[PDB]
Amino acid sequence: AGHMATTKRVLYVGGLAEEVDDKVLHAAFIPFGDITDIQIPLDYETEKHRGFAFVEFELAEDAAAAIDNMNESELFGRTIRVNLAKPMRIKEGSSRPVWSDDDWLKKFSGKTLEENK
């Protein structure tokens, strides 16, 4: 079967509550491995938290496990999304695949990512 490129150790987060600051994501994502950086970009229209953020770790198996355990999860009483960044450039100009959510999230929702080896 097909799969996304070797891009790892990074995760986008969206749908955040108005209180999910950097220390909140640091405590919400640490049980899966060991975090190494966090990001809280503003809306840059009124200089306030836009409701989305980023996470990074020193290991790739932690980031992939959070896609398997924190995708469509819930923070602050509301749903949130977790996934590796889409094909738009990232904070360091790195390129990425298209990340089509139909097939990728279908194989992450099914047990097929663990039955195979």
Place this chain on the structure above:
RNA sequence: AAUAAA
């Protein structure tokens, strides 16, 4: 899903 504000 993002306009990656340290």
